[PDB]
Amino acid sequence: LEKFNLIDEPWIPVLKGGRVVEVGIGEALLRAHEFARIETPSPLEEAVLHRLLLAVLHRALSGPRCPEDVLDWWRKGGFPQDPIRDYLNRFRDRFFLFHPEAPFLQVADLPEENPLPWSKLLPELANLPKATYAQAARALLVHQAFAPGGLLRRYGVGSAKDAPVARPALFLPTGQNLLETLLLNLVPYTPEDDAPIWEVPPLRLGDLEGARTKWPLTGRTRVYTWPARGVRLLDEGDGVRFMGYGPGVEPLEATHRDPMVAQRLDAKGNLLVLRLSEERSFWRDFSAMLPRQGGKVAATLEHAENLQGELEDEGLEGRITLRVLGQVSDQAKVLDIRREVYPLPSGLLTPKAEENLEKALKMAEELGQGLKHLAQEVAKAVVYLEELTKLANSLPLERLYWHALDGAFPRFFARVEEEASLDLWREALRGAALEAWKATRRFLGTGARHLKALAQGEQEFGRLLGEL
C-alpha cells in the first residue's frame, strides 16, 4: 500500500566505475562525487532527474545564496550532509511512489476505473509490457516536465496546456562527476515564495477537474516539480501497466524564467525561448541568446561560466562541458528528442568572446544564405513549382555545408576567447562550402540536362568563395 520510496530505492541510473547502477535520491546526493554522471539513453530522463535533485538541494540547503557557497562545496568535495538528511527525513513520507494519501507527483483519488496504459507517459515520436517501479517513476517525471498541450477530454477538461519545459531547449552544464554537475547547475537561490510539490498539500481530483486549480508558473522548485497532469500509477503487485489520468494544475503566465531556459528576439522584437529545431543546427542560436543581441542566456550557463572562472583563479581547473537537452516539437506532436554536447569555453561570456561568436555565426549565416541562393538558381536552371522543390531539396549543398560545420563548431567554440579563432572558422567555412559544392558537382555531373545549371553554379560558387 505504502510502497517504493524514491529516497531509498534504486531508480536513478548513474555511471559508477564504468557500469550503470541505480540509486535513490539520498545516495545520489550524499555520494554525488562517486558517479561520473546520470546515465540514460533518454535526454528527457536525464533532464528531469537533474531537476528533481536540484529541487531537493535548493530546498534542503535553502540556497546556495552565493556562488561562494557553491565553491566551498566544490572545494570540500561534497554537499553539507546533515541539512540534506534532515530535509529528506522530514519529507520522506511524500516520496513514496504508491501511497494511500500522498503518492509522489500523483493524485491519490483519481479513479482506478477505465485507466490508460503507462505508455501514454512516454514520448511518441512522430502488446503492453509491465514497467518496473523504477521505470514508472522515471516515465512519470518525464511526463510532468515535457507533456505537450493538446486533447485531453477527461474530468471536465477538454484540452491540457504544455507542461513547463515541453518546448524549450534545456542548458545543462556538466562536470566530471555528478557532484560537479549538480554544482554547475546550482544557481544562487532564495526559498521565498517557492515550494516544490511535496511541500504543499497533496492534490485531489476535486481540485483539478474543470481545471479548478490555477497557479502562476513561478518559483524555481515549484516549476522543477510542476504537476502538469493528474496521474495515479496503479500497482500490479510488482510493477505498473496502467494509470488513472486527468488534468492538470493550470499554468498562469508569470515573469519567471526557468534557469535552464534561454531566450532570443524574433524579427519583431518578441522574446522567444531557444528551442531545438528539426533541421536547423542548435548552435546557430548561440549569439542570439546573448543580451548584446537582445537575448537571454540560461541562468545555469551564466552560473557555470562564472564558477568556471573562479575555479580558474584557484588553479582548481576542471573539465566542464555543456549538454543541451529537449524535444523537437510541433503543437501536440513530439518529432524528436535530442541530446547535444558542446565545450563550455572558459571566457565565453566576455565581450571579446561574445564578439567573436557574433562574427563567426554571421559569416556562417551569410555564406549559407549564398549557398541557399546558389541551390535555388541551380534548380531553376535545370527545370512545376513542385518540380523545383524536390530538386533544390535533393541537392546536397546546404545539408552538407551545415553538417560539416556541426563537426567544426566545437573546435572553434572551445577557442572563442582567442582572436586567432575567427581565422580557424573561416578555414572551416571554406572547407565546408568546398566539400558541399564538390558533392553537388558530383550530383550535377551525371545528366546532360544538369550541365547548364552546373556551369552557372560553378561560376556563382566562385563568386561566393571570393568574398570569404
Same domain for 306 and 355, yes or no, is no
Q: How many CA atoms lie within 13 A of 374 on its CB side?
A: 28
Closest CA to 154 of 204, 210, 103, 112: 210
49's grid cell: 532527474
CB-count exposure of residue 392 (10 Å: 0-12, 13-18, 19+): buried
Cβ pair 356, 73 in contact under 8 A: no
Q: What angle do CA 170, 172, 175 make, to 5 degrees?
A: 170
**Among the three residues 313, 346, 379, which one is the final residue of a domain in this structure?**
346
Q: Who's near 448: CB < 8 A, 6+ residues apart?
A: none
Count of domains forming the chain: 2
Same domain for 332 and 355, yes or no, is no
Same domain for 223 and 253, yes or no, is yes
Cβ pair 466, 459 in contact under 8 A: no
Same domain for 337 and 361, yes or no, is no
Same domain for 114 and 258, yes or no, is yes
Closest CA to 412 of 317, 338, 342: 342
Q: What are phi and psi of 115, to 5 degrees?
A: -80, 170
161's grid cell: 496546456
CA distance 157 to 164: 18
**Among the three residues 282, 316, 346, which one is the final residue of a domain in this structure?**
346
Same domain for 338 and 372, yes or no, is no
CB-count exposure of residue 26 (10 Å: 0-12, 13-18, 19+): buried
Q: Residue 465's domain spans which residues?
A: 347-468
Same domain for 301 and 330, yes or no, is yes
Resolution in Å, one decimal place: 2.3
Range 142-180 burial, b when 16+ CB lie within 10 A, else e: bbbbbbbbeebebbebeebbbbbbbbbbbbbbbbebbbb
Q: What are phi and psi of 131, to 5 degrees?
A: -75, 145
Same domain for 39 and 187, yes or no, is yes
CA dist list (Å): 113 to 73, 232, 244, 251 = 49, 11, 7, 27
Same domain for 274 and 389, yes or no, is no
Same domain for 107 and 147, yes or no, is yes
Cβ pair 362, 425 in contact under 8 A: no
Same domain for 329 and 445, yes or no, is no
Using the structure block, give the residue that is written with the C-alpha cell 536552371: 381
Q: What angle do CA 202, 198, 246 make, to 5 degrees?
A: 45
Cβ pair 172, 165 in contact under 8 A: no
- Cα 249 → chain centroid: 22
What's the distance, Cα to Cα, between the start and end of the chain in Å? 69
Q: What are phi and psi of 393, to 5 degrees?
A: -65, -35
**Among the three residues 291, 321, 346, which one is the final residue of a domain in this structure?**
346
Using the structure block, give the residue that is written with the C-alpha cell 477538461: 157
Q: What are phi and psi of 296, to 5 degrees?
A: -135, 125
CA dist list (Å): 455 to 10, 84, 379, 381, 436 = 64, 70, 13, 10, 16
Cβ pair 404, 436 in contact under 8 A: yes
Q: How many CA atoms lie within 13 A of 17 on its CB side?
A: 2
CA distance 379 to 278: 23
CA dist list (Å): 76 to 69, 79, 119, 179, 180 = 11, 8, 43, 11, 12
**Torsion angle (degrees, nearest 10) of CA 2, 8, 11, 17:** -160
- Count of beta carbons in the 10 Å neighbourhood of residue 129: 11
Same domain for 268 and 368, yes or no, is no
Closest CA to 131 of 229, 236, 277: 236
